[PDB]
Amino acid sequence: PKLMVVVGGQAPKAIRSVECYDFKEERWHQVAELPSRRCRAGMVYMAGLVFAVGGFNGSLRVRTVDSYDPVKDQWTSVANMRDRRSTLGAAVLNGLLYAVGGFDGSTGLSSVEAYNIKSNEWFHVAPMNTRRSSVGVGVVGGLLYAVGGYDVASRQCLSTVECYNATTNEWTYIAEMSTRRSGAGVGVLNNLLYAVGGHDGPLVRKSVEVYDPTTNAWRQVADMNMCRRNAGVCAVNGLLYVVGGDDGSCNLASVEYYNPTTDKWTVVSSCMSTGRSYAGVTVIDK
Ligand code: NA
């Protein structure tokens, strides 16, 4: 029994609200608001806690990292990252929380940090080949993938994808996506890595592509119902949920999900209390 948790984001104002979707009841409720306005953060579930990593508070990019205990319904801080980091991705690999890329107001970042919950310490990880802002991250089969993004220096959206091996501590390019996607939602389902939506310039994509590490190849799947950049993604009971994001007009309050066995996207009838892009999304136990 799972709750999908949606944390902060931009509405377009940076917000504190955290909402959870209850799959049995098919409805949203609010839980404890974030300690601060936070959008453009990484978000993972780890050791029973939701971690909101970095991002933007409406004025400044931040290095703060806050964790939510859903049994207590309370936010508390963990160690700050070395670097202020926004539009990053975050994922858990081998019990460590990786904070990948982003932007700090001045430059985009190839830098990567890893958090050890036992010692409450972040440490330096090998950097990516490319500096990627608005990057999406997912872990499949012991490897961590950094998908697309925006290359600040080149002022363009990226089609390239890279993969991190923790044993060798290096990032290597893998097969490119079919198209450039900054702000792609990235999620994993049945050992496939999905890249949903994103954008190349001001037009927002509804297209979706899936990567198989066994073939090192991408292929198209069904388009989403809405164009979405900077949507959150998670996987629940065989289905890939895409939450909010920006459609080129508004921050969406809608959620839709992909059924890989029918190659169909279905819009959830109940919307969030607020539209959100650049919101954290993860799944916890109810
Ligand atoms: Na930013």
Query: How far is the centre of ligand 1, averaged over its atoms, from the C-alpha of 55 (Å)?
Result: 7
Q: Could you tell me the distance, in angstroms and rounded to a whole number, from the CA of residue 168 to the centre of ligand 1?
A: 30
- Buried residues in 170-203 as b, exposed as e (16+ CB within 10 A): ebeebeebebbbbbbbbbbbeebbbbbbbbbeee
Q: Which two tokens stand for residue 184?
A: 């792609």
Q: What angle do CA 127, 129, 135 make, to 5 degrees?
A: 80
**Ligand 1 center–CA 215 separation, angstroms:** 34
Given resolution (angstroms): 2.0
How many whole angstroms from 109 Cα to the centroid of ligand 1? 11
Rounded distance from Cα 224 to ligand 1 centre (Å): 26
Compute, in angstroms, the gap from residue 41 CA to the centroid of ligand 1: 9
In degrees to the nearest 10, what's the CA dihedral of 203, 204, 208, 213? 90
CA of 3 to the centre of ligand 1 (A): 28
Whole-number Cα distances in Å, 269 to 27, 111, 140, 196, 209: 9, 39, 30, 20, 24
Domains, the chain, with CATH or none: 1-286 (2.120.10.80)
Order of strands, sheet of 280-285, starting from the edge strand that comes earlier in the sequence: 27-31, 18-22, 2-7, 280-285
d(CA 178, ligand 1 centre) in Å: 26
Q: How far apart are CA 92 and CA 51, in angstroms?
A: 11
Technique used by the depositors: X-ray
Alpha-carbon distance 31 to 208, whole Å? 31
In sequence order, what DSSP letters do the residues of 32-85 get, joined into one string? PPPSS--BS-EEEEETTEEEEES-B-SSSB---EEEEETTTTEEEEEPPPSS--
Burial of 48-85, coded b for 16+ CB within 10 Å and e otherwise, reads ebbbbbbbbbeeebbbbbbbbebeeeebeebeebebbb
